[PDB]
């Protein structure tokens, strides 16, 4: 493996308009964010009330 230089540069220079370049990070934080969604959606609060 080599340091992704051209990747890193043509990453920085033009930020990606498609999606997050590092999905593993979003997955790493996935717990809380999905907790919030399942709160609002997923008929969670409506069950509580």
């Amino acid at each position: 493996m080599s340091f992704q230089t051209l990747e890193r540069e043509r990453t920085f220079k033009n930020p990606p308009k498609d999606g997050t370049s590092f999905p593993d990070l979003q997955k790493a934080v996935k717990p809380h964010v999905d907790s919030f969604n399942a709160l609002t959606n997923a008929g969670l609060l409506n069950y509580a009330v």
Binding site: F22, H32, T40
Partner: protein, 49 residues
Amino acid sequence: RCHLEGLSPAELIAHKEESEEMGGYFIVNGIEKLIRMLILPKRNHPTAI
């Protein structure tokens, strides 16, 4: 329920959040608060004690 979900790093740069924003904290008074994960016993399984 934020205006940042689904956003690509590009428009995140259009706002003043870094390219790989994570989300996961409630912003109160400005300071990044967070609810810790805590361990409970198992759901609904009768445990011996």
